[PDB]
Amino acid sequence: MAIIKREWLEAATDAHKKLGWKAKGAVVSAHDPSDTAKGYASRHGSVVKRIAEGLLMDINEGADWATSLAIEDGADHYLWDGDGVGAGLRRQTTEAFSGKKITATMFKGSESPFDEDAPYQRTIGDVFRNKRAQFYYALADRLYLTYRAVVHGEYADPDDMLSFDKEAIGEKMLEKLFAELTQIQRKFNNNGKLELMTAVEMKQKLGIPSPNLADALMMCMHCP
Numbered sequence: 165m166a167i168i169k170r171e172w173l174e175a176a177t178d179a180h181k182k183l184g185w186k187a188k189g190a191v192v193s194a195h196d197p198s199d200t201a202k203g204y205a206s207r208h209g210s211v212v213k214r215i216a217e218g219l220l221m222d223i224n225e226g227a228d229w230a231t232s233l234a235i236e237d238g239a240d241h242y243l244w245d246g247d248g249v250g251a252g253l254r255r256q257t258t259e260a261f262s263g264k265k266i267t268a269t270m271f272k273g274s275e276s277p278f279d280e281d282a283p284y285q286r287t288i289g290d291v292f293r294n295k296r297a298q299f300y301y302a303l304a305d306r307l308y309l310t311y312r313a314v315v316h317g318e319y320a321d322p323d324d325m326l327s328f329d330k331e332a333i334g335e336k337m338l339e340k341l342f343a344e345l346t347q348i349q350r351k352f353n354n355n356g357k358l359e360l361m362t363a364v365e366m367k368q369k370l371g372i373p374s375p376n377l378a379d380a381l382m383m384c385m386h387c388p
């Protein structure tokens with residue numbers, strides 16, 4: 165039921181070095197303010213460069229922490245989870261980015277998918293229940309393609325892959341991320357759409373704590 169294989173994550177570690185390409189594109193950062201530990205993720209194009217945990221912070225301290233990291237990382241775009249306790253953080257977030265060319269986007273995972281009437285590559289809306297499922301599968305698809313390139317020698321466009329810059333991220337935090345990603349699970353859906361267990365469900369059913377590093381990385385798959 166899990167959507168991401170550990171072997172893909174191991175392959176994707178330093179995949180850009182293994183395959184000889186460089187990060188190109190926008191810098192995208194995202195923040196998970198927790199249900200009520202926090203998460204932050206940042207990538208430059210297809211290369212993930214920071215995974216950070218935000219400990220012993222209230223909601224406003226967490227947002228200061230995450231927005232400061234976004235500034236430090238040279239973000240072009242910043243997203244944060246607004247489905248729960250984060251729903252009120254827009255003012256603080258825009259204040260943090262005053263005078264800086266950084267866009268701020270509230271991510272709501274429970275929304276219908278982005279661009280849902282577009283064809284699925286029938287429509288995106290037929291395939292994914294919501295944005296949480298859509299962007300976790302964007303992540304899973306990038307990782308699988310990266311695995312096939314790294315381990316099976318199957319060409320893929322770097323723009324469609326994802327590499328973890330291990331030296332930038334740090335081994336400990338990369339391991340924490342990976343331990344969360346392999347816990348993200350599909351759940352039954354009565355309309356035949358892809359849908360994932362929520363944190364609440366993961367906690368109650370399986371005793372799994374909130375995967376906020378994973379969620380932060382998932383949100384940064386959406387470049388607004």
Ligand SMILES: [Mn+2]
Pocket residue numbers: 196197198199245248379
């Ligand atoms: Mn969240």
Ligand SMILES: [Mn+2]
Pocket residue numbers: 196198199245363374375376379
């Ligand atoms: Mn979360």
